[PDB]
Write an enzyme that holds these catalytic residues in place. Structure first.
Site, PDB file in Angstrom:
ATOM      1  N   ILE A   5       0.854  -1.180   0.000  1.00 20.66           N
ATOM      2  CA  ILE A   5       0.000   0.000   0.000  1.00 20.66           C
ATOM      3  C   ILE A   5       0.891   1.231   0.000  1.00 20.66           C
ATOM      4  O   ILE A   5       1.856   1.305   0.771  1.00 20.66           O
ATOM      5  CB  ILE A   5      -0.941   0.006   1.218  1.00 20.66           C
ATOM      6  CG1 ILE A   5      -1.858  -1.219   1.191  1.00 20.66           C
ATOM      7  CG2 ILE A   5      -1.754   1.286   1.255  1.00 20.66           C
ATOM      8  CD1 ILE A   5      -2.442  -1.571   2.541  1.00 20.66           C
ATOM      9  N   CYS A   6       0.569   2.193  -0.858  1.00 15.86           N
ATOM     10  CA  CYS A   6       1.244   3.488  -0.874  1.00 15.86           C
ATOM     11  C   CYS A   6       0.363   4.463  -0.099  1.00 15.86           C
ATOM     12  O   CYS A   6      -0.580   5.040  -0.648  1.00 15.86           O
ATOM     13  CB  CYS A   6       1.498   3.963  -2.298  1.00 15.86           C
ATOM     14  SG  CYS A   6       2.554   5.428  -2.406  1.00 15.86           S
ATOM     15  N   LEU A   7       0.667   4.630   1.185  1.00 13.60           N
ATOM     16  CA  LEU A   7      -0.036   5.567   2.050  1.00 13.60           C
ATOM     17  C   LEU A   7       0.986   6.191   2.987  1.00 13.60           C
ATOM     18  O   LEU A   7       1.719   5.475   3.674  1.00 13.60           O
ATOM     19  CB  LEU A   7      -1.147   4.863   2.835  1.00 13.60           C
ATOM     20  CG  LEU A   7      -1.928   5.710   3.840  1.00 13.60           C
ATOM     21  CD1 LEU A   7      -2.590   6.909   3.170  1.00 13.60           C
ATOM     22  CD2 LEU A   7      -2.963   4.850   4.548  1.00 13.60           C
TER      23      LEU A   7
END
Lengths: 154, 166
Positions: free
Chosen positions: A89-91
């Site tokens: 996840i890109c967060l």
């Protein structure tokens, strides 16, 4: 080491001391490893992910909550900010913008908000992001819904 | 004699031309449906009777994803009811969940690159040209062959003619 256990106890307490309707989030602390958690999150309504249930794997580092947990999708998901093959996840709150103010529950909520409000930039799935940036919202919803029906409905 | 002739079924012909390509993406307008524009799909959708036998043999052997550009939600329903009217969905073959819809031509390229099929079937030359870099095999369905097709982009007048013969 003992500060992490105290914090994780407050969070295990809070996920047990609640029977709230609409359990969009269900954190399951693990049998024998306090630092391994799994979460079940409901796809946000009015999104192509509605009706699906997505499994998240948490790997909590021992300096937690001073260090963010490692979170990834185990359920396949078609999303601009999720690597389809790995579930990463890109967060930013999982990386640079983490703070001890965050909790495992609120992390799940940030992920749900991310599912409802993607960021076509910062893309880990360029095909998913291209559909949104090019204005093909029907196409994005169509493919995201298909993968929800095929991979996130057990 | 009993020992020295031969004759293949349609399934063997289709599977042979597929060349072990057991994942396939394919547009709807023109190649599967009689309609030739999304505007027509707002009025009606009709499966080409001549594509049905070959189409079903493809679904038994290959994971298939149908996709098309549409202009509204009612067009999607008309398409799904057309596919069902022709019996295109079968146990062991195509399911309704694997019919995709978009609002742009280039949106199909996003579907295909995500799905990574062995075959993509389209009629738009810019899509076939753009996907030849990524997709092993393609069928470009057109009245006349493009002056230039990639070496891995094959051309024919119909799906049933390319996969349904030798």
């Amino acid at each position: 080491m003992q500060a992490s256990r105290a914090r994780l106890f407050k969070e295990y307490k809070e996920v047990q001391r609640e029977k709230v309707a609409d359990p969009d989030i269900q954190l399951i602390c693990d049998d024998t490893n306090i630092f391994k958690w799994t979460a079940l999150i409901k796809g946000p309504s009015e999104t192509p992910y509605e009706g699906g249930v997505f499994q998240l794997a948490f790997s909590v580092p021992e300096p937690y909550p001073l260090q963010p947990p490692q979170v990834r999708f185990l359920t396949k998901i078609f999303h601009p900010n999720v690597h389809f093959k790995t579930g990463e996840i890109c967060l930013d709150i999982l990386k640079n913008a983490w703070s001890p103010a965050w909790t495992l529950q609120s992390v799940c909520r940030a992920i749900i908000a991310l599912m409802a409000h993607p960021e076509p930039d910062s893309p880990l799935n360029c095909d998913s992001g291209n559909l949104l940036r090019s204005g093909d919202v029907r196409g994005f919803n169509s493919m995201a819904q298909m993968y929800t029906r095929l991979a996130a409905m057990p | 004699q009993f020992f020295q002739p031969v004759k293949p079924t349609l399934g063997q012909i289709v599977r042979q031309k597929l060349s072990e390509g057991r994942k396939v993406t394919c547009r709807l307008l023109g190649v599967i449906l009689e309609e030739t524009s999304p505007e027509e799909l707002q009025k009606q959708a009709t499966v080409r009777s001549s594509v049905l036998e070959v189409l079903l043999e493809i679904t038994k052997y290959s994971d298939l994803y149908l996709m098309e550009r549409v202009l509204d939600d009612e067009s999607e329903a008309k398409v799904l009811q057309a596919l069902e009217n022709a019996g295109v969905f079968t146990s062991g073959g195509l399911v309704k969940d694997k019919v995709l819809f978009c609002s742009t031509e280039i949106g199909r390229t996003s579907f295909v690159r995500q799905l990574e099929p062995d075959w993509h079937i389209d009629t738009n030359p810019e899509i076939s040209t753009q996907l030849a870099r990524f997709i092993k095999y393609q069928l470009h369905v057109a009245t006349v062959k493009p002056e230039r097709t990639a070496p891995n982009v094959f051309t024919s007048q119909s799906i049933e003619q390319f996969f349904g013969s030798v």
